Amino acid sequence: AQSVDQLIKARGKVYFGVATDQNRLTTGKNAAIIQADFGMVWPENSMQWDATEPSQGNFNFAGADYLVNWAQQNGKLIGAGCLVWHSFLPSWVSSITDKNTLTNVMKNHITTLMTRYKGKIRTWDVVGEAFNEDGSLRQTVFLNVIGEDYIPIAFQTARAADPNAKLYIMDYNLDSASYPKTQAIVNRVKQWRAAGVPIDGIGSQTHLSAGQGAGVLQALPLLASAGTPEVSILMLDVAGASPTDYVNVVNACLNVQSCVGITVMGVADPDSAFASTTPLLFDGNFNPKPAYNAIVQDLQQ
Amino acid sequence: AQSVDQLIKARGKVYFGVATDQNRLTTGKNAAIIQADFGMVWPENSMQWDATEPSQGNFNFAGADYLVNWAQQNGKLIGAGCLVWHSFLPSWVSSITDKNTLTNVMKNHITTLMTRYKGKIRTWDVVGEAFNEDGSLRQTVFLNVIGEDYIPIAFQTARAADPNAKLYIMDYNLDSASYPKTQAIVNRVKQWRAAGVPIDGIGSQTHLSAGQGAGVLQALPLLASAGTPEVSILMLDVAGASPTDYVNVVNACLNVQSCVGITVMGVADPDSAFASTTPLLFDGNFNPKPAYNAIVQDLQQ
């Protein structure tokens, strides 16, 4: 099976990547497929807040360390995240009500994780899912306690911790150009960057239903109009794994100059959180599915 | 699918169990299958030394806590391990050369883990893979630095930390009654128990090639002749997943009064470390394989 990462690099992009973690790399055929076919790895779960700081100051890095070392040994780029994401917060964080304390807790979490891997991580997802569907800011503990400046603070802190990393904000339901959330994140990122906030990229969490790939062809250029140096496609999977949907997403990447690459959410269908929708590029026997071969043919042209 | 755990309990045994961990419970159909069909869970990796104490005295319990909570919420028994196993040691341990220091480090590791989960764990695998294939003791850091007393110390320390748990020694290649390692572990366990060492069980790590199930019918009664209150089948998988091999292992369990149950290495073939041998009871689409149905029929007859 030809390598989608090699082929996308030949078209001028940076990577075709995949999310993984230690117990994937030691089972199935995941390591062999990643070695041959993908150019970047992300930790699925091992870098999230609940996995890395389950109680205050008690950092759990064993799983993340394994993935970083494996990637370095095998010549792969590393992306990591998410530093600030309400969905993976442990209870001790969401109980904090003092603005000074929560600011320092957020800063220490960012600084500790980024310093540990300083210079080794290409892309950090710093803030995730900060927007409501109507485009207002999501009322998470960080917004409620710190206020809207928590986003500037997070990015400023991350830039100081590792100036080499590309810093991204990420969100989902940015797959349609007419959806209010898509326009809102563009407007807010434009404003933040105009005031000097170091947001290098917007990452679109592309968890799609059948037939939604076509809309990404119009949504991704819109996200790119915010003026960040980079945009990316993250967490990609498609219910039913139709070649048409997957090829449309790949072509959206190719059409947007600032889109650096694509990361799929897993290797093989049985290891998806959405396994009954068989939404990935390899089947339960680790054979490439028609969508994989269709991407290969699209990138060869 | 009828539950092998309910059927084996109806035959007078304690459980039919499976190894798992957090990211299995959140993907595929693993949680649903475990809820319906298995009565005990073990952490595959999250309790091993390299996952729980990656630096001296500094413990990581996020993954293990998740599995213990999940098991309690779903009414499942819990087994855990391995407290002392050379294959999962961090480098900081294997570089210790002082007998008193290594003894204290080992005792602290045992006591900290077992205290955290005191009263919640049915079975602890305390020492693993302590024997060479010829029956002599494996020359790990523990044997080289502490000496052969490390095994009595480990069990004595474990009994004091949680007197409710059943304490096991485990090894592999105990599948043939005429293999030297099988008789050696019997010899040594008899001696240790005569000296008052609290070894409650021998666990046989049953990682089998095709056709090796039949030999377990003679090996397991031999293991039971050491006189421990319990024996168990652990880490069970069979290359090719022949019904004949799986049924022979199940019947060995039924034939040995002190054998309390069986634990299979995982749920579905693609998540095995030996996936190309398709050695588990569910396939890559999470359908029960012929071996599963054969076990069901064997337990009903």
Ligand SMILES: O=[N+]([O-])c1ccc2nn[nH]c2c1
């Ligand atoms: O692209 N990704 O698959 C991915 C997975 C988990 C993440 N956490 N933060 N960013 C992430 C990206």
Ligand SMILES: O=[N+]([O-])c1ccc2nn[nH]c2c1
């Ligand atoms: O039975 N088991 O699958 C199993 C898995 C991992 C272990 N670590 N210690 N004991 C273990 C048993």
